[PDB]
């Protein structure tokens, strides 16, 4: 997320074994980043 | 930082000859280059200076309509096409380099330059 | 004539006056947009009681 000019990155790992869906359960994901961008954001997409 | 001369030599009178003077070694920057000449027991006498950045060229009286000063920055070359040789084009021709930039294109006649070439000899016949 | 380059350079030399003698010189301006303040000073910290 992004707000106030700063991008908020939070992230949490697990394993699973669940090839066809999300798994149902509850986990928090705990903070990673936080960078002083001030940088207008619309859009994104992924690299793999 | 060293200046090497090439080209001239022998040439009968009414012919052309070009002079190259390749500059080799580190260069901070280079502001004009030259050509002098010297003749046998004259002193030695300006002919032509180009601005390295622009292009334009300074002519002795001598030598106008009759000389070109060109530059390749690329090659870090000065060359002086000399047409129309006479008998009184006879000399050693020293290529000179100067870091000094002036605003005004004439000082580039009588400043003292920083750097000299080994001098190559051009011999006009009849 | 009436055509000069724009540029010239400077008589720096060891036995030059002061006043002709190179001087560095670095201008510090300082920025407030609409974004985070990231440069910031040391506050140093004191013990701990
Ligand atoms: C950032 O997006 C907002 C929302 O549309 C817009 O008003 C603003 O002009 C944008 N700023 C920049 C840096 O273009």
């Known amino acids: 997320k992004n707000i106030d000019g700063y991008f908020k990155i939070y992230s949490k790992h697990t394993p699973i074994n669940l090839v066809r869906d999300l798994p149902q359960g509850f986990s928090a994901l705990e903070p990673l980043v936080d960078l002083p961008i001030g940088i207008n954001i619309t859009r994104f997409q992924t690299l793999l | 930082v060293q200046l090497v001369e090439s080209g001239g030599g022998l040439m009968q009178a009414g012919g052309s000859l070009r002079l190259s003077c390749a500059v080799s070694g580190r260069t901070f920057s280079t502001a004009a280059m030259g050509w002098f000449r010297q003749a046998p027991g004259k002193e030695r006498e300006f002919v032509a200076a180009?601005?390295?950045?622009?292009?334009?060229?300074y002519y002795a009286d001598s030598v106008k309509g009759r000389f070109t000063i060109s530059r390749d920055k690329a090659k870090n070359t000065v060359y002086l096409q000399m047409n129309s040789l006479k008998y009184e084009d006879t000399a050693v021709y020293y290529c000179?380099?100067?870091?000094?930039?002036?605003?005004?294109?004439?000082?580039?006649?009588?400043?003292?330059?920083?750097?000299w070439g080994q001098g190559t000899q051009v011999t006009v016949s009849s | 004539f009436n055509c000069y380059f724009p540029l010239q350079s400077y008589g720096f030399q060891p036995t030059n006056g002061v006043g002709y003698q190179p001087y560095r010189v670095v201008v510090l301006s300082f920025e407030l947009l609409h974004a985070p303040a990231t440069v910031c000073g040391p506050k140093k910290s004191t013990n701990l009681v």
């Open positions: 180009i601005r390295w950045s622009g292009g334009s060229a």
């Open positions: 000179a380099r100067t870091e000094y930039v002036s605003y005004l294109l004439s000082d580039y006649a009588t400043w003292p330059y920083d750097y």
